[PDB]
C-alpha cells in the first residue's frame, strides 16, 4: 500500500488517521497534520480512520423483532437485541439482525 495502517492516502501523500470517535475535518499538508473533529451525535467511528464524516448509527427495527441492547456511541455502532420473548435467528458480530417469537 501507499501508506501504512496508521495513515491514509490523500492524493500522492499520506496523512495521519483520526482516532475512533473522530473524523477528518482537514487533510494534512507540509505545515499541518490532519485536523480531526468529533463524530456528530448519532454517528460513530470504531477505528482509526480517514473518513470525512462518521458512520450513521444503525436503527433497530421493531418489525424485525429488534430493540436496542446497547446504544450507539461515538466509537461503537448500535447493538440490537431481541424484544421480550423473542430470540435471534441471525447475527452480524455483536448485533442481532432478525428475531423470531418463541
PDB file of N, CA and C in Angstrom:
ATOM      1  N   UNK A   1       0.811  -1.225   0.000  1.00  0.00           N
ATOM      2  CA  UNK A   1       0.000   0.000   0.000  1.00  0.00           C
ATOM      3  C   UNK A   1       0.844   1.274   0.000  1.00  0.00           C
ATOM      4  N   UNK A   2       0.230   2.378  -0.416  1.00  0.00           N
ATOM      5  CA  UNK A   2       0.877   3.684  -0.420  1.00  0.00           C
ATOM      6  C   UNK A   2       1.231   4.109   1.005  1.00  0.00           C
ATOM      7  N   UNK A   3       0.332   3.817   1.944  1.00  0.00           N
ATOM      8  CA  UNK A   3       0.511   4.235   3.335  1.00  0.00           C
ATOM      9  C   UNK A   3       0.420   3.049   4.285  1.00  0.00           C
ATOM     10  N   UNK A   4       1.097   3.156   5.423  1.00  0.00           N
ATOM     11  CA  UNK A   4       0.968   2.161   6.482  1.00  0.00           C
ATOM     12  C   UNK A   4      -0.372   2.318   7.185  1.00  0.00           C
ATOM     13  N   UNK A   5      -0.685   1.380   8.077  1.00  0.00           N
ATOM     14  CA  UNK A   5      -2.018   1.302   8.672  1.00  0.00           C
ATOM     15  C   UNK A   5      -2.464   2.556   9.433  1.00  0.00           C
ATOM     16  N   UNK A   6      -1.535   3.230  10.099  1.00  0.00           N
ATOM     17  CA  UNK A   6      -1.885   4.397  10.912  1.00  0.00           C
ATOM     18  C   UNK A   6      -2.145   5.653  10.069  1.00  0.00           C
ATOM     19  N   UNK A   7      -1.929   5.544   8.760  1.00  0.00           N
ATOM     20  CA  UNK A   7      -2.112   6.676   7.850  1.00  0.00           C
ATOM     21  C   UNK A   7      -3.056   6.325   6.720  1.00  0.00           C
ATOM     22  N   UNK A   8      -3.532   7.341   6.002  1.00  0.00           N
ATOM     23  CA  UNK A   8      -4.440   7.108   4.883  1.00  0.00           C
ATOM     24  C   UNK A   8      -4.023   7.994   3.706  1.00  0.00           C
ATOM     25  N   UNK A   9      -4.282   7.545   2.472  1.00  0.00           N
ATOM     26  CA  UNK A   9      -3.807   8.315   1.311  1.00  0.00           C
ATOM     27  C   UNK A   9      -4.674   9.524   1.000  1.00  0.00           C
ATOM     28  N   UNK A  10      -4.017  10.638   0.689  1.00  0.00           N
ATOM     29  CA  UNK A  10      -4.682  11.848   0.233  1.00  0.00           C
ATOM     30  C   UNK A  10      -3.919  12.271  -1.005  1.00  0.00           C
ATOM     31  N   UNK A  11      -4.441  11.953  -2.181  1.00  0.00           N
ATOM     32  CA  UNK A  11      -3.657  12.180  -3.379  1.00  0.00           C
ATOM     33  C   UNK A  11      -2.378  11.375  -3.302  1.00  0.00           C
ATOM     34  N   UNK A  12      -1.246  12.028  -3.552  1.00  0.00           N
ATOM     35  CA  UNK A  12       0.030  11.323  -3.570  1.00  0.00           C
ATOM     36  C   UNK A  12       0.752  11.360  -2.227  1.00  0.00           C
ATOM     37  N   UNK A  13       0.081  11.880  -1.196  1.00  0.00           N
ATOM     38  CA  UNK A  13       0.679  11.929   0.139  1.00  0.00           C
ATOM     39  C   UNK A  13      -0.049  10.969   1.079  1.00  0.00           C
ATOM     40  N   UNK A  14       0.549  10.750   2.248  1.00  0.00           N
ATOM     41  CA  UNK A  14      -0.093  10.004   3.332  1.00  0.00           C
ATOM     42  C   UNK A  14      -0.344  10.954   4.487  1.00  0.00           C
ATOM     43  N   UNK A  15      -1.485  10.785   5.155  1.00  0.00           N
ATOM     44  CA  UNK A  15      -1.845  11.621   6.302  1.00  0.00           C
ATOM     45  C   UNK A  15      -2.204  10.775   7.509  1.00  0.00           C
ATOM     46  N   UNK A  16      -1.933  11.289   8.716  1.00  0.00           N
ATOM     47  CA  UNK A  16      -2.322  10.526   9.911  1.00  0.00           C
ATOM     48  C   UNK A  16      -3.826  10.366  10.002  1.00  0.00           C
ATOM     49  N   UNK A  17      -4.268   9.168  10.350  1.00  0.00           N
ATOM     50  CA  UNK A  17      -5.689   8.926  10.569  1.00  0.00           C
ATOM     51  C   UNK A  17      -6.164   9.578  11.856  1.00  0.00           C
ATOM     52  N   UNK A  18      -7.472   9.813  11.921  1.00  0.00           N
ATOM     53  CA  UNK A  18      -8.100  10.304  13.146  1.00  0.00           C
ATOM     54  C   UNK A  18      -8.450   9.111  14.029  1.00  0.00           C
ATOM     55  N   UNK A  19      -8.557   9.362  15.324  1.00  0.00           N
ATOM     56  CA  UNK A  19      -8.851   8.314  16.301  1.00  0.00           C
ATOM     57  C   UNK A  19     -10.311   7.891  16.243  1.00  0.00           C
ATOM     58  N   UNK A  20     -10.628   6.703  16.786  1.00  0.00           N
ATOM     59  CA  UNK A  20     -12.048   6.346  16.924  1.00  0.00           C
ATOM     60  C   UNK A  20     -12.822   7.439  17.663  1.00  0.00           C
ATOM     61  N   UNK A  21     -14.043   7.718  17.202  1.00  0.00           N
ATOM     62  CA  UNK A  21     -14.848   8.798  17.746  1.00  0.00           C
ATOM     63  C   UNK A  21     -14.643  10.132  17.051  1.00  0.00           C
ATOM     64  N   UNK A  22     -13.743  10.137  16.065  1.00  0.00           N
ATOM     65  CA  UNK A  22     -13.389  11.357  15.346  1.00  0.00           C
ATOM     66  C   UNK A  22     -13.430  11.117  13.837  1.00  0.00           C
ATOM     67  N   UNK A  23     -13.404  12.202  13.069  1.00  0.00           N
ATOM     68  CA  UNK A  23     -13.306  12.118  11.614  1.00  0.00           C
ATOM     69  C   UNK A  23     -12.474  13.293  11.124  1.00  0.00           C
ATOM     70  N   UNK A  24     -12.086  13.241   9.854  1.00  0.00           N
ATOM     71  CA  UNK A  24     -11.223  14.257   9.272  1.00  0.00           C
ATOM     72  C   UNK A  24     -11.980  15.534   8.924  1.00  0.00           C
ATOM     73  N   UNK A  25     -11.512  16.648   9.481  1.00  0.00           N
ATOM     74  CA  UNK A  25     -12.018  17.963   9.110  1.00  0.00           C
ATOM     75  C   UNK A  25     -11.168  18.577   7.997  1.00  0.00           C
ATOM     76  N   UNK A  26      -9.853  18.391   8.079  1.00  0.00           N
ATOM     77  CA  UNK A  26      -8.939  18.970   7.100  1.00  0.00           C
ATOM     78  C   UNK A  26      -7.797  17.995   6.895  1.00  0.00           C
ATOM     79  N   UNK A  27      -7.505  17.694   5.632  1.00  0.00           N
ATOM     80  CA  UNK A  27      -6.380  16.826   5.279  1.00  0.00           C
ATOM     81  C   UNK A  27      -5.052  17.441   5.694  1.00  0.00           C
ATOM     82  N   UNK A  28      -4.046  16.589   5.863  1.00  0.00           N
ATOM     83  CA  UNK A  28      -2.721  17.074   6.218  1.00  0.00           C
ATOM     84  C   UNK A  28      -2.020  17.743   5.029  1.00  0.00           C
ATOM     85  N   UNK A  29      -0.978  18.494   5.344  1.00  0.00           N
ATOM     86  CA  UNK A  29      -0.123  19.108   4.339  1.00  0.00           C
ATOM     87  C   UNK A  29       1.246  19.263   4.959  1.00  0.00           C
ATOM     88  N   UNK A  30       2.176  19.908   4.265  1.00  0.00           N
ATOM     89  CA  UNK A  30       3.510  20.019   4.842  1.00  0.00           C
ATOM     90  C   UNK A  30       3.508  20.719   6.197  1.00  0.00           C
ATOM     91  N   UNK A  31       2.704  21.772   6.330  1.00  0.00           N
ATOM     92  CA  UNK A  31       2.745  22.580   7.547  1.00  0.00           C
ATOM     93  C   UNK A  31       1.776  22.166   8.654  1.00  0.00           C
ATOM     94  N   UNK A  32       0.783  21.337   8.339  1.00  0.00           N
ATOM     95  CA  UNK A  32      -0.208  20.949   9.351  1.00  0.00           C
ATOM     96  C   UNK A  32      -0.595  19.477   9.249  1.00  0.00           C
ATOM     97  N   UNK A  33      -0.660  18.790  10.387  1.00  0.00           N
ATOM     98  CA  UNK A  33      -1.178  17.431  10.403  1.00  0.00           C
ATOM     99  C   UNK A  33      -2.680  17.427  10.208  1.00  0.00           C
ATOM    100  N   UNK A  34      -3.232  16.234  10.032  1.00  0.00           N
ATOM    101  CA  UNK A  34      -4.672  16.045   9.900  1.00  0.00           C
ATOM    102  C   UNK A  34      -5.391  16.774  11.027  1.00  0.00           C
ATOM    103  N   UNK A  35      -6.445  17.512  10.681  1.00  0.00           N
ATOM    104  CA  UNK A  35      -7.300  18.119  11.702  1.00  0.00           C
ATOM    105  C   UNK A  35      -8.503  17.214  11.874  1.00  0.00           C
ATOM    106  N   UNK A  36      -8.738  16.795  13.114  1.00  0.00           N
ATOM    107  CA  UNK A  36      -9.789  15.829  13.427  1.00  0.00           C
ATOM    108  C   UNK A  36     -10.828  16.480  14.326  1.00  0.00           C
ATOM    109  N   UNK A  37     -12.096  16.133  14.117  1.00  0.00           N
ATOM    110  CA  UNK A  37     -13.180  16.650  14.957  1.00  0.00           C
ATOM    111  C   UNK A  37     -14.055  15.479  15.413  1.00  0.00           C
ATOM    112  N   UNK A  38     -14.776  15.633  16.532  1.00  0.00           N
ATOM    113  CA  UNK A  38     -15.606  14.515  16.990  1.00  0.00           C
ATOM    114  C   UNK A  38     -16.726  14.153  16.025  1.00  0.00           C
ATOM    115  N   UNK A  39     -17.099  12.878  16.015  1.00  0.00           N
ATOM    116  CA  UNK A  39     -18.303  12.424  15.319  1.00  0.00           C
ATOM    117  C   UNK A  39     -19.522  13.231  15.759  1.00  0.00           C
ATOM    118  N   UNK A  40     -20.429  13.465  14.821  1.00  0.00           N
ATOM    119  CA  UNK A  40     -21.711  14.087  15.138  1.00  0.00           C
ATOM    120  C   UNK A  40     -22.501  13.159  16.048  1.00  0.00           C
ATOM    121  N   UNK A  41     -23.420  13.722  16.850  1.00  0.00           N
ATOM    122  CA  UNK A  41     -24.300  12.819  17.594  1.00  0.00           C
ATOM    123  C   UNK A  41     -25.014  11.871  16.638  1.00  0.00           C
ATOM    124  N   UNK A  42     -25.253  10.638  17.089  1.00  0.00           N
ATOM    125  CA  UNK A  42     -25.904   9.598  16.288  1.00  0.00           C
ATOM    126  C   UNK A  42     -25.033   9.092  15.141  1.00  0.00           C
ATOM    127  N   UNK A  43     -23.724   9.351  15.228  1.00  0.00           N
ATOM    128  CA  UNK A  43     -22.766   8.757  14.293  1.00  0.00           C
ATOM    129  C   UNK A  43     -21.578   8.193  15.081  1.00  0.00           C
ATOM    130  N   UNK A  44     -20.771   7.347  14.434  1.00  0.00           N
ATOM    131  CA  UNK A  44     -19.661   6.695  15.133  1.00  0.00           C
ATOM    132  C   UNK A  44     -18.489   6.412  14.201  1.00  0.00           C
ATOM    133  N   UNK A  45     -17.313   6.234  14.790  1.00  0.00           N
ATOM    134  CA  UNK A  45     -16.192   5.672  14.054  1.00  0.00           C
ATOM    135  C   UNK A  45     -15.472   4.747  15.020  1.00  0.00           C
ATOM    136  N   UNK A  46     -15.377   3.472  14.658  1.00  0.00           N
ATOM    137  CA  UNK A  46     -14.871   2.471  15.601  1.00  0.00           C
ATOM    138  C   UNK A  46     -13.372   2.269  15.515  1.00  0.00           C
ATOM    139  N   UNK A  47     -12.764   2.780  14.450  1.00  0.00           N
ATOM    140  CA  UNK A  47     -11.348   2.537  14.218  1.00  0.00           C
ATOM    141  C   UNK A  47     -10.653   3.816  13.820  1.00  0.00           C
ATOM    142  N   UNK A  48      -9.320   3.793  13.829  1.00  0.00           N
ATOM    143  CA  UNK A  48      -8.542   4.850  13.189  1.00  0.00           C
ATOM    144  C   UNK A  48      -9.082   4.993  11.780  1.00  0.00           C
ATOM    145  N   UNK A  49      -9.281   6.226  11.329  1.00  0.00           N
ATOM    146  CA  UNK A  49      -9.960   6.393  10.057  1.00  0.00           C
ATOM    147  C   UNK A  49      -9.576   7.677   9.345  1.00  0.00           C
ATOM    148  N   UNK A  50      -9.840   7.712   8.043  1.00  0.00           N
ATOM    149  CA  UNK A  50      -9.647   8.926   7.274  1.00  0.00           C
ATOM    150  C   UNK A  50     -10.959   9.393   6.683  1.00  0.00           C
ATOM    151  N   UNK A  51     -12.042   9.159   7.425  1.00  0.00           N
ATOM    152  CA  UNK A  51     -13.400   9.481   6.980  1.00  0.00           C
ATOM    153  C   UNK A  51     -13.674  10.978   7.001  1.00  0.00           C
ATOM    154  N   UNK A  52     -14.406  11.483   6.006  1.00  0.00           N
ATOM    155  CA  UNK A  52     -14.819  12.889   6.034  1.00  0.00           C
ATOM    156  C   UNK A  52     -16.084  13.111   6.868  1.00  0.00           C
ATOM    157  N   UNK A  53     -16.747  12.010   7.216  1.00  0.00           N
ATOM    158  CA  UNK A  53     -17.966  12.007   8.019  1.00  0.00           C
ATOM    159  C   UNK A  53     -17.924  10.732   8.839  1.00  0.00           C
ATOM    160  N   UNK A  54     -18.421  10.757  10.069  1.00  0.00           N
ATOM    161  CA  UNK A  54     -18.586   9.483  10.779  1.00  0.00           C
ATOM    162  C   UNK A  54     -19.748   8.679  10.198  1.00  0.00           C
ATOM    163  N   UNK A  55     -19.806   7.398  10.546  1.00  0.00           N
ATOM    164  CA  UNK A  55     -20.805   6.484  10.008  1.00  0.00           C
ATOM    165  C   UNK A  55     -22.102   6.603  10.792  1.00  0.00           C
ATOM    166  N   UNK A  56     -23.244   6.514  10.101  1.00  0.00           N
ATOM    167  CA  UNK A  56     -24.522   6.614  10.816  1.00  0.00           C
ATOM    168  C   UNK A  56     -24.763   5.421  11.745  1.00  0.00           C
ATOM    169  N   UNK A  57     -25.276   5.677  12.943  1.00  0.00           N
ATOM    170  CA  UNK A  57     -25.666   4.583  13.838  1.00  0.00           C
ATOM    171  C   UNK A  57     -26.832   3.811  13.239  1.00  0.00           C
ATOM    172  N   UNK A  58     -26.776   2.478  13.279  1.00  0.00           N
ATOM    173  CA  UNK A  58     -27.865   1.669  12.727  1.00  0.00           C
ATOM    174  C   UNK A  58     -29.126   1.799  13.564  1.00  0.00           C
ATOM    175  N   UNK A  59     -30.294   1.695  12.921  1.00  0.00           N
ATOM    176  CA  UNK A  59     -31.525   1.599  13.707  1.00  0.00           C
ATOM    177  C   UNK A  59     -31.747   0.159  14.164  1.00  0.00           C
ATOM    178  N   UNK A  60     -32.703  -0.048  15.065  1.00  0.00           N
ATOM    179  CA  UNK A  60     -33.127  -1.394  15.434  1.00  0.00           C
ATOM    180  C   UNK A  60     -34.624  -1.488  15.161  1.00  0.00           C
ATOM    181  N   UNK A  61     -34.989  -2.249  14.135  1.00  0.00           N
ATOM    182  CA  UNK A  61     -36.351  -2.219  13.619  1.00  0.00           C
ATOM    183  C   UNK A  61     -37.259  -3.188  14.370  1.00  0.00           C
ATOM    184  N   UNK A  62     -38.295  -2.664  15.046  1.00  0.00           N
ATOM    185  CA  UNK A  62     -39.273  -3.486  15.765  1.00  0.00           C
ATOM    186  C   UNK A  62     -39.986  -4.465  14.842  1.00  0.00           C
ATOM    187  N   UNK A  63     -40.065  -4.148  13.551  1.00  0.00           N
ATOM    188  CA  UNK A  63     -40.724  -5.034  12.589  1.00  0.00           C
ATOM    189  C   UNK A  63     -39.945  -6.331  12.407  1.00  0.00           C
ATOM    190  N   UNK A  64     -38.676  -6.306  12.800  1.00  0.00           N
ATOM    191  CA  UNK A  64     -37.812  -7.478  12.766  1.00  0.00           C
ATOM    192  C   UNK A  64     -37.626  -8.039  14.183  1.00  0.00           C
ATOM    193  N   UNK A  65     -38.446  -7.566  15.123  1.00  0.00           N
ATOM    194  CA  UNK A  65     -38.416  -8.041  16.499  1.00  0.00           C
ATOM    195  C   UNK A  65     -37.271  -7.453  17.301  1.00  0.00           C
ATOM    196  N   UNK A  66     -36.702  -6.355  16.812  1.00  0.00           N
ATOM    197  CA  UNK A  66     -35.497  -5.807  17.433  1.00  0.00           C
ATOM    198  C   UNK A  66     -35.744  -4.658  18.384  1.00  0.00           C
ATOM    199  N   UNK A  67     -34.847  -4.535  19.363  1.00  0.00           N
ATOM    200  CA  UNK A  67     -34.818  -3.418  20.299  1.00  0.00           C
ATOM    201  C   UNK A  67     -33.345  -3.039  20.465  1.00  0.00           C
ATOM    202  N   UNK A  68     -33.076  -1.899  21.096  1.00  0.00           N
ATOM    203  CA  UNK A  68     -31.693  -1.501  21.377  1.00  0.00           C
ATOM    204  C   UNK A  68     -31.169  -2.273  22.583  1.00  0.00           C
ATOM    205  N   UNK A  69     -30.025  -2.931  22.419  1.00  0.00           N
ATOM    206  CA  UNK A  69     -29.381  -3.628  23.530  1.00  0.00           C
ATOM    207  C   UNK A  69     -28.221  -2.808  24.088  1.00  0.00           C
ATOM    208  N   UNK A  70     -27.434  -2.181  23.211  1.00  0.00           N
ATOM    209  CA  UNK A  70     -26.508  -1.158  23.678  1.00  0.00           C
ATOM    210  C   UNK A  70     -26.588  -0.009  22.698  1.00  0.00           C
ATOM    211  N   UNK A  71     -26.786   1.212  23.190  1.00  0.00           N
ATOM    212  CA  UNK A  71     -26.987   2.301  22.247  1.00  0.00           C
ATOM    213  C   UNK A  71     -25.669   2.646  21.582  1.00  0.00           C
ATOM    214  N   UNK A  72     -25.798   3.325  20.461  1.00  0.00           N
ATOM    215  CA  UNK A  72     -24.660   3.773  19.698  1.00  0.00           C
ATOM    216  C   UNK A  72     -23.890   4.792  20.522  1.00  0.00           C
ATOM    217  N   UNK A  73     -22.570   4.827  20.341  1.00  0.00           N
ATOM    218  CA  UNK A  73     -21.729   5.834  20.983  1.00  0.00           C
ATOM    219  C   UNK A  73     -20.809   6.342  19.892  1.00  0.00           C
ATOM    220  N   UNK A  74     -19.986   7.338  20.204  1.00  0.00           N
ATOM    221  CA  UNK A  74     -19.105   7.905  19.183  1.00  0.00           C
ATOM    222  C   UNK A  74     -18.104   6.878  18.649  1.00  0.00           C
ATOM    223  N   UNK A  75     -17.885   5.789  19.380  1.00  0.00           N
ATOM    224  CA  UNK A  75     -16.927   4.773  18.939  1.00  0.00           C
ATOM    225  C   UNK A  75     -17.519   3.389  18.650  1.00  0.00           C
ATOM    226  N   UNK A  76     -18.839   3.239  18.774  1.00  0.00           N
ATOM    227  CA  UNK A  76     -19.446   1.918  18.647  1.00  0.00           C
ATOM    228  C   UNK A  76     -20.830   2.020  18.013  1.00  0.00           C
ATOM    229  N   UNK A  77     -21.098   1.205  16.994  1.00  0.00           N
ATOM    230  CA  UNK A  77     -22.414   1.183  16.358  1.00  0.00           C
ATOM    231  C   UNK A  77     -23.440   0.632  17.339  1.00  0.00           C
ATOM    232  N   UNK A  78     -24.698   0.996  17.134  1.00  0.00           N
ATOM    233  CA  UNK A  78     -25.798   0.431  17.918  1.00  0.00           C
ATOM    234  C   UNK A  78     -25.746  -1.086  17.880  1.00  0.00           C
ATOM    235  N   UNK A  79     -25.970  -1.720  19.031  1.00  0.00           N
ATOM    236  CA  UNK A  79     -26.117  -3.165  19.069  1.00  0.00           C
ATOM    237  C   UNK A  79     -27.580  -3.495  19.340  1.00  0.00           C
ATOM    238  N   UNK A  80     -28.211  -4.174  18.392  1.00  0.00           N
ATOM    239  CA  UNK A  80     -29.625  -4.519  18.524  1.00  0.00           C
ATOM    240  C   UNK A  80     -29.764  -5.883  19.159  1.00  0.00           C
ATOM    241  N   UNK A  81     -30.778  -6.031  20.010  1.00  0.00           N
ATOM    242  CA  UNK A  81     -31.140  -7.323  20.570  1.00  0.00           C
ATOM    243  C   UNK A  81     -32.595  -7.652  20.271  1.00  0.00           C
ATOM    244  N   UNK A  82     -33.116  -8.699  20.898  1.00  0.00           N
ATOM    245  CA  UNK A  82     -34.491  -9.115  20.630  1.00  0.00           C
ATOM    246  C   UNK A  82     -35.471  -8.576  21.644  1.00  0.00           C
ATOM    247  N   UNK A  83     -36.715  -8.371  21.213  1.00  0.00           N
ATOM    248  CA  UNK A  83     -37.771  -7.986  22.145  1.00  0.00           C
ATOM    249  C   UNK A  83     -38.029  -9.126  23.126  1.00  0.00           C
ATOM    250  N   UNK A  84     -38.728  -8.820  24.213  1.00  0.00           N
ATOM    251  CA  UNK A  84     -39.039  -9.849  25.203  1.00  0.00           C
ATOM    252  C   UNK A  84     -39.715 -11.046  24.552  1.00  0.00           C
ATOM    253  N   UNK A  85     -39.369 -12.241  25.020  1.00  0.00           N
ATOM    254  CA  UNK A  85     -39.949 -13.458  24.472  1.00  0.00           C
ATOM    255  C   UNK A  85     -39.571 -13.791  23.039  1.00  0.00           C
ATOM    256  N   UNK A  86     -38.548 -13.116  22.513  1.00  0.00           N
ATOM    257  CA  UNK A  86     -38.043 -13.373  21.164  1.00  0.00           C
ATOM    258  C   UNK A  86     -36.599 -13.882  21.217  1.00  0.00           C
ATOM    259  N   UNK A  87     -36.120 -14.485  20.131  1.00  0.00           N
ATOM    260  CA  UNK A  87     -34.739 -14.959  20.080  1.00  0.00           C
ATOM    261  C   UNK A  87     -34.141 -14.658  18.716  1.00  0.00           C
ATOM    262  N   UNK A  88     -32.818 -14.543  18.668  1.00  0.00           N
ATOM    263  CA  UNK A  88     -32.134 -14.118  17.456  1.00  0.00           C
ATOM    264  C   UNK A  88     -31.955 -15.264  16.473  1.00  0.00           C
ATOM    265  N   UNK A  89     -32.269 -15.011  15.205  1.00  0.00           N
ATOM    266  CA  UNK A  89     -32.095 -16.030  14.171  1.00  0.00           C
ATOM    267  C   UNK A  89     -30.977 -15.693  13.173  1.00  0.00           C
ATOM    268  N   UNK A  90     -30.345 -14.529  13.337  1.00  0.00           N
ATOM    269  CA  UNK A  90     -29.167 -14.156  12.539  1.00  0.00           C
ATOM    270  C   UNK A  90     -28.375 -12.984  13.131  1.00  0.00           C
ATOM    271  N   UNK A  91     -27.058 -13.162  13.262  1.00  0.00           N
ATOM    272  CA  UNK A  91     -26.191 -12.116  13.811  1.00  0.00           C
ATOM    273  C   UNK A  91     -25.235 -11.529  12.788  1.00  0.00           C
ATOM    274  N   UNK A  92     -24.712 -10.361  13.147  1.00  0.00           N
ATOM    275  CA  UNK A  92     -23.590  -9.725  12.480  1.00  0.00           C
ATOM    276  C   UNK A  92     -22.719  -9.209  13.619  1.00  0.00           C
ATOM    277  N   UNK A  93     -21.796 -10.041  14.093  1.00  0.00           N
ATOM    278  CA  UNK A  93     -20.956  -9.669  15.220  1.00  0.00           C
ATOM    279  C   UNK A  93     -21.735  -9.592  16.522  1.00  0.00           C
ATOM    280  N   UNK A  94     -21.629  -8.454  17.213  1.00  0.00           N
ATOM    281  CA  UNK A  94     -22.344  -8.208  18.472  1.00  0.00           C
ATOM    282  C   UNK A  94     -23.805  -7.834  18.241  1.00  0.00           C
ATOM    283  N   UNK A  95     -24.253  -7.903  16.991  1.00  0.00           N
ATOM    284  CA  UNK A  95     -25.537  -7.322  16.615  1.00  0.00           C
ATOM    285  C   UNK A  95     -26.522  -8.362  16.085  1.00  0.00           C
ATOM    286  N   UNK A  96     -27.759  -8.331  16.574  1.00  0.00           N
ATOM    287  CA  UNK A  96     -28.777  -9.226  16.034  1.00  0.00           C
ATOM    288  C   UNK A  96     -29.488  -8.569  14.860  1.00  0.00           C
ATOM    289  N   UNK A  97     -29.656  -9.322  13.778  1.00  0.00           N
ATOM    290  CA  UNK A  97     -30.257  -8.796  12.556  1.00  0.00           C
ATOM    291  C   UNK A  97     -31.759  -9.087  12.459  1.00  0.00           C
ATOM    292  N   UNK A  98     -32.172 -10.250  12.949  1.00  0.00           N
ATOM    293  CA  UNK A  98     -33.594 -10.579  12.980  1.00  0.00           C
ATOM    294  C   UNK A  98     -33.918 -11.501  14.142  1.00  0.00           C
ATOM    295  N   UNK A  99     -35.091 -11.306  14.737  1.00  0.00           N
ATOM    296  CA  UNK A  99     -35.559 -12.139  15.838  1.00  0.00           C
ATOM    297  C   UNK A  99     -36.874 -12.807  15.470  1.00  0.00           C
ATOM    298  N   UNK A 100     -37.182 -13.905  16.149  1.00  0.00           N
ATOM    299  CA  UNK A 100     -38.473 -14.565  15.990  1.00  0.00           C
ATOM    300  C   UNK A 100     -39.079 -14.802  17.367  1.00  0.00           C
ATOM    301  N   UNK A 101     -40.414 -14.845  17.454  1.00  0.00           N
ATOM    302  CA  UNK A 101     -41.022 -15.126  18.756  1.00  0.00           C
ATOM    303  C   UNK A 101     -40.876 -16.597  19.139  1.00  0.00           C
ATOM    304  N   UNK A 102     -40.863 -16.880  20.444  1.00  0.00           N
ATOM    305  CA  UNK A 102     -40.967 -18.246  20.977  1.00  0.00           C
ATOM    306  C   UNK A 102     -40.968 -18.219  22.499  1.00  0.00           C
TER     307      UNK A 102
END
